[PDB]
Design a protein around this ligand. Structure first.
Ligand SMILES: CCCCCCCCCCCCCCCCCC(=O)OC[C@H](COP(=O)([O-])OCC(O)COP(=O)([O-])OC[C@@H](COC(=O)CCCCCCCCCCCCCCCCC)OC(=O)CCCCCCCCCCCCCCCCC)OC(=O)CCCCCCCCCCCCCCCCC
Ligand SMILES: CCCCCCCCCCCCCCCCCC(=O)OC[C@H](COP(=O)(O)OCCN)OC(=O)CCCCCCCCCCCCCCCCC
Ligand SMILES: CCCCCCCCCCCCCCCCCC(=O)OC[C@H](COP(=O)(O)OCCN)OC(=O)CCCCCCCCCCCCCCCCC
Ligand SMILES: CCCCCCCCCCCC(=O)OC[C@H](COP(=O)(O)OCC[N+](C)(C)C)OC(=O)CCCCCCCCCCC
Lengths: 124, 45, 246, 71, 85, 44, 52, 163, 106, 83
């Protein structure tokens, strides 16, 4: 009843109980149940989309709303990436020139050939 | 000292069956390779 | 590679000592807020977990030092100009690490008892089968890094034969180019922040145990695996199950 | 002295280590092979290669100083 | 390992109530005493007591059951009925 | 003000005093200072 | 568990575990001291390789 | 005496023998035996590492062919080099230590044969992962360690959260 | 909405329990938790005698909002209970006899 | 501690706290099979073992590279980046 996908199924039931689905994980665990692990009593009606609301269903978390948690996730990622990218600008320059190698950058030793020394060959 | 459950024989029927089959197959393989080395063709061929 | 090898040892020691601490409690609770003070009750587990933590915080003369510090420094020594940001990120991560290591240490051994009396009566060490491997991993997590630093971090070492592009190789630059500030700052910060966390916990608990709504919100975000697990379970997994139903 | 290309191949020096004093790399690696890469040994050879690399990096920082000065 | 006995539960509960301050008297605490009547505990004070009891034996009381215990006998029997105590 | 102040006393008494609670936090340190001084002497 | 809501007795710990604790702590502290002494210049950061 | 052979095969024995015979041996012997096999493996690995530091000439073990279709020639080929020996150090040390630790930690539990067999299985498949000489053997180990991770994290099968 | 009724009793005792559990969860330090508990006690004490329906209803609503504002991401739960880490661990098997399903085959 | 468990449930792992009364003799059998298998395979796989370097000579290596150059010259084969 509550969720859009359960509402979508309402024309497709004929003479089956339109149950309001409640996540079985959120049923408080101190009541007694015929199957304690599944928190279900015998002959309890099942919602049409039950398989999305039983205990085996993916866990749901109640602390933040889903939309709010999305805001937090995207916010952390954006602030981290943006702070790093802007930090790239305010960077000190090094002090020693990059190292170099004999024989025009050892272009012979990393394969290479006389006709192609740009593909293979170090800073020389 | 932990407790002690009832005795059970080491070699069960399944141990015998599977070990016997596997070992017989390996022995057969070695016999064919040797019989190749001597006869110049494997006994199965 | 060298950090992987060094980290394996003291990480296993952390986990094993944690298992001993849990096993010492009748409730077998794992919550850090319910352990209280066990330093008198469990000295050997305390020393093992302490060695493991100090190796992890890269304290001088320990195995974690010869891995973690030099990895932190290679970022500054990297030829790519942009990696200097990575230096500060990793540095923050290191002092961050000292924070939670000290939090666990204090809340397990240094804080006032939080569990009921019968547990502290019955709190006792574990058997020989648990103790011996902790001892062995302790000698490893103290000595292995020093005895092996030459093999993996050597000036000219040919043991691992990976063919590094000469342009990319910078392990000399990261040692010669480093300054006293950058080569000392992680160690000094680690020692200070450890002491700071301990003294703040023992003397000014309010600053940790405030009640601000905004700070409680950010703490809640961080506590739930950075609210990522929420994002996955709702937006990927649950949406996929819905689409499968469709 | 800068090593011969033939010598440098014959000792199988790593490409990134092949510099103006792989010459001191060769004895250091031989020592490190005789001992079992133990930290306490090969001290003299290890120091010798490091002092190369000191001179080496020094010419580099001066080259960057000159480049900086041009700008 | 460690196993508790009914008398051990009762002794711990008696000591717990003895050290509580808002009690009328310590000597009057009986096994069948009513906290509401005999010891004269407030609406909320018995709540504080049940919180103390769960914190002491390391259990968790649901709301519907906590308010059900009114006498110390009820509390001792309830704590003895739970296996992990 | 606390009505359970008698319940909580033991959490701050003998084994859980600040002096005792931080005792044994550096095991073997005295043996270590003795040994380091001795090695300083022996090395010269 | 004789005393409740009262001061607790001094914990009883095995001889072996105290001896193990003393050995591990002594070894870690002594090793750390030895390492700092032997590497002080390099670990603290001295003898700058740049030209004066 | 072949270091590479014993390294790959002792953990395999420590894995399979509990599964084949656990009802016939019982968790006392199973625990002691798996632990001992892992210890022997660890010692062999240390000796090999010592020699490799002496002489960096890795051992190769080339066995029957997995696949010989078209241009693809895949073989069960194993080698132990500097990288592999580093990984094997970590793996065998920590596996031996954890096997010893689980004797004490797990002394109360009913199902200790299966637990120790699974620990040994995971050790074996990780050794396969790091010792294989081509990406295919790497993948074999890569997925079997996932299988064992599934079987270990859900070791307490009756716990819903575990599964 | 009764100023003093059994249902009022049950409701406020439950909320007061809640508040205390929240305080324990939030504060790591024992001493600090004690002062928070005593402050919570004083705050409940002050508003105990409210009589008119509007003010009592407003106070109860506001305290519910306060408690919802200060709910903890993860409450402390002992290992052997639903939120616990021992829960359903090595559940002892139900003792049962085998029912047969086939006349010829066990 | 322990609890009752159905005795009819037969598992090849042994079930609950399996500790057979003849476990020492079955243990002797098991360790005998273990040493037998380990030794047999260690010996059997010995011929398939070899070192990494030193297997072939420089003669073979250089002549093979020269032959490869011959092949690449019979065909029209430039090198990588040679353009
Ligand atoms: C190398 C050579 C190996 C070759 C194959 C050997 C297999 C032998 C099988 C056997 O023994 O017979 C039993 C078999 C029936 O099994 P059963 O035992 O009677 O089962 C009844 C009860 O379960 C039995 O009683 P139970 O209820 O008590 O048993 C319960 C069950 C347990 O219950 C379970 O839960 C089982 C779980 C699944 C197990 C089944 C998977 C089998 C896994 C094999 C082992 C994996 C090892 C890992 C890899 C190692 C590689 C070697 O037990 C098992 O079945 C598990 C068996 C494991 C036994 C292992 C013990 C071996 C001892 C080794 C000793 C070593 C000696 C060293 C000494 C050295 C001295 C020099 O009967 C047969 O003979 C079948 C013939 C088929 C042979 C192979 C098929 C080839 C042809 C197929 C087609 C070819 C390709 C496809 C072509 C397609 C068209 C072109
Ligand atoms: C970057 C994007 C990340 C992608 C990650 C891969 C996604 C598949 C992972 C599926 C999964 O792991 O779900 C497992 C889920 C258990 O999750 P949970 O209930 O929270 O565990 C409680 C234990 N404490 O148990 C389940 O819910 C199983 C039910 C089916 C799970 C998959 C449903 C299909 C939805 C699409 C999955 C991804 C499709 C390809 C991408
Ligand atoms: C390569 C091929 C290797 C093939 C291995 C041969 C299989 C022989 C071992 C199977 C026996 C294990 C077993 O019986 O597990 C049953 C287990 C319950 O047994 P137990 O722990 O004793 O008792 C608990 C409640 N009675 O019930 C369980 O918990 C299930 C655990 C099953 C473990 C199976 C191990 C094999 C995993 C690899 C599968 C890869 C498939 C490809
Ligand atoms: C428990 C793991 C033990 C693995 C090693 C121990 C074996 C001792 C001998 C070593 C040689 C070897 O393994 O191959 C075994 C044999 C011999 O092949 P090969 O020509 O000598 O090898 C080539 C080496 N070259 C490259 C140097 C030449 O190959 C085969 O018949 C291939 C058929 C696969 C087995 C048939 C399936 C039956 C298994 C049943 C599944 C449950």
């Amino acid at each position: 009843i509550r969720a859009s996908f359960d509402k979508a199924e309402e024309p497709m039931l004929g003479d089956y109980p339109d149950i309001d689905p409640f996540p079985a994980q959120l049923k408080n665990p101190y009541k007694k149940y015929d199957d304690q692990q599944d928190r279900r009593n015998l002959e309890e009606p099942l919602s049409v989309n039950d398989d999305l609301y039983d205990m085996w269903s993916p866990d749901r978390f109640t602390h933040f709303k889903n939309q709010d948690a999305l805001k937090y996730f995207i916010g952390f990622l954006t602030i981290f990436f943006g702070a790093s990218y802007v930090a790239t600008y305010f960077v000190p320059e090094k002090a020693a020139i990059p190292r170099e190698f004999p024989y025009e950058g050892l272009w012979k030793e990393s394969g290479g050939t006389e006709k192609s020394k740009a593909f293979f060959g170090q800073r020389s | 000292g932990p407790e002690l459950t009832p005795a059970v024989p080491f070699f069960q029927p399944y141990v015998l069956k599977w070990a016997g089959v596997s070992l017989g197959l390996v022995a057969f393989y070695q016999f064919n390779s040797s019989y190749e080395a001597k006869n110049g063709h494997t006994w199965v061929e | 590679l060298f950090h992987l090898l060094g980290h394996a040892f003291f990480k296993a020691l952390l986990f094993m000592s944690a298992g001993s601490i849990i096993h010492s409690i009748l409730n077998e609770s794992q919550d850090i807020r319910t352990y209280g003070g066990l330093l008198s009750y469990l000295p050997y587990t305390y020393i093992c977990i302490t060695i493991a933590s100090l190796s992890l915080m890269a304290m001088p003369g320990l195995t974690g030092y010869y891995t973690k510090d030099i990895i932190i420094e290679s970022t500054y020594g990297s030829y790519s100009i942009s990696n200097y940001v990575v230096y500060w990120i990793a540095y923050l991560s290191a002092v961050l690490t000292c924070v939670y290591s000290m939090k666990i240490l204090y809340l397990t051994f240094y804080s006032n008892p939080n569990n009921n009396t019968i547990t502290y009566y019955n709190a006792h060490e574990s058997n020989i089968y648990i103790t011996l491997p902790m001892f062995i991993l302790a000698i490893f997590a103290m000595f292995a890094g020093w005895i092996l630093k030459d093999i993996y971090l050597g000036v000219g070492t040919d043991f691992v034969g990976t063919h590094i592009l000469p342009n990319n190789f910078s392990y000399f630059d990261t040692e010669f180019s480093i300054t006293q500030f950058y080569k000392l700052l992680p160690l000094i910060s680690a020692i200070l922040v450890s002491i700071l966390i301990v003294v703040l916990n023992e003397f000014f608990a309010i600053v940790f145990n405030l009640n601000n709504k905004y700070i409680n919100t950010v703490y809640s975000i961080f506590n739930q695996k950075l609210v990522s697990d929420q994002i996955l379970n709702h937006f990927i997994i649950f949406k996929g199950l819905v689409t499968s139903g469709n | 002295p800068l090593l011969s290309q033939e010598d440098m191949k014959k000792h199988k020096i790593l490409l990134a280590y092949r510099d103006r004093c792989a010459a001191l790399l060769v004895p250091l690696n031989e020592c490190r092979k005789k001992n079992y890469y133990m930290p306490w040994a090969c001290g003299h050879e290890r120091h010798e290669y490091e002092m190369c690399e000191v001179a080496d990096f020094q010419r580099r920082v001066k080259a960057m100083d000159k480049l900086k000065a041009e700008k | 390992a460690h196993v508790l006995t009914k008398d051990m539960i009762q002794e711990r509960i008696v000591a717990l109530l003895e050290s509580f301050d808002k009690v009328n008297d310590a000597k009057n605490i009986t096994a069948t005493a009513n906290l509401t009547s005999d010891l004269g505990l407030d609406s909320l004070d018995v709540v504080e007591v049940v919180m103390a009891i769960e914190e002491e034996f390391g259990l968790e009381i649901p709301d519907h059951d906590a308010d059900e215990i009114k006498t110390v006998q009820q509390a001792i029997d309830y704590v003895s009925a739970q296996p992990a105590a | 003000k606390d009505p359970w102040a008698r319940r909580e006393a033991w959490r701050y008494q003998t084994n859980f005093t600040r002096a005792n609670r931080f005792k044994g936090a550096a095991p073997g340190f005295g043996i270590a200072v003795v040994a380091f001084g001795a090695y300083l002497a022996a090395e010269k | 568990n004789y005393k409740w809501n009262g001061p607790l007795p001094r914990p009883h710990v095995s001889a072996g575990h105290r001896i193990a604790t003393k050995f591990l702590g002594a070894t870690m502290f002594f090793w750390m001291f030895l390492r700092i002494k032997e590497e002080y210049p390099a670990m603290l950061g001295l003898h700058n390789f740049y030209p004066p | 005496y072949n270091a590479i052979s014993l390294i790959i095969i002792l953990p395999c024995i420590s894995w399979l023998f509990p599964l084949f015979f656990g009802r016939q041996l019982g968790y006392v012997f199973v625990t002691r035996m798996t632990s001992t096999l892992i210890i022997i493996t660890t010692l062999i690995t240390y000796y090999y590492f010592y020699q490799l530091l002496g002489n960096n000439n890795p051992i190769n073990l080339e066995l029957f062919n997995y696949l010989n279709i078209d241009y693809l020639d895949i073989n069960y080929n194993f080698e132990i080099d500097a990288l592999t020996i580093t990984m094997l150090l970590a793996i065998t040390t920590i596996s031996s230590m954890v096997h010893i630790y689980s004797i004490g930690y797990m002394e109360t539990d009913p199902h200790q044969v299966r637990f120790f067999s699974l620990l040994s299985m995971f050790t074996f498949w990780m050794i396969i992962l790091v010792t294989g000489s081509n990406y295919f053997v790497l993948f074999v180990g890569w997925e079997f360690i996932g299988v064992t991770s599934y079987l270990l994290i859900s070791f307490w099968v009756t716990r819903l959260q575990a599964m | 909405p009764v100023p003093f009724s059994a249902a009022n009793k049950k409701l406020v005792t439950s909320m007061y329990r809640q508040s205390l559990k929240l305080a324990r969860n939030w504060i790591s330090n024992r001493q600090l938790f004690r002062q928070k508990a005593v402050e919570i006690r004083h705050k409940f004490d002050q508003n105990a005698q409210i009589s008119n329906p509007r003010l009592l209803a407003r106070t109860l609503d506001e305290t519910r909002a306060h408690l919802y504002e200060f709910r903890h991401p993860d409450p402390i739960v002992p290992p052997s209970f639903p939120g616990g880490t021992k829960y359903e661990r090595n559940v002892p098997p139900r003792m049962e006899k085998i029912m047969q399903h086939n006349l010829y085959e066990p | 501690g322990r609890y009752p468990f159905p005795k009819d449930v037969i598992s090849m792992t042994g079930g609950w706290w399996a500790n057979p009364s003849n476990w020492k003799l079955n243990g002797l059998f098991a360790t005998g099979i273990a040493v037998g298998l380990a030794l047999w395979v260690s010996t059997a796989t010995l011929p398939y073992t070899r070192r990494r370097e030193g297997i072939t000579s420089e003669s073979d290596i250089s002549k093979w590279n020269a032959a490869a150059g011959v092949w690449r010259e019979r065909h029209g084969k430039i090198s990588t980046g040679e353009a």
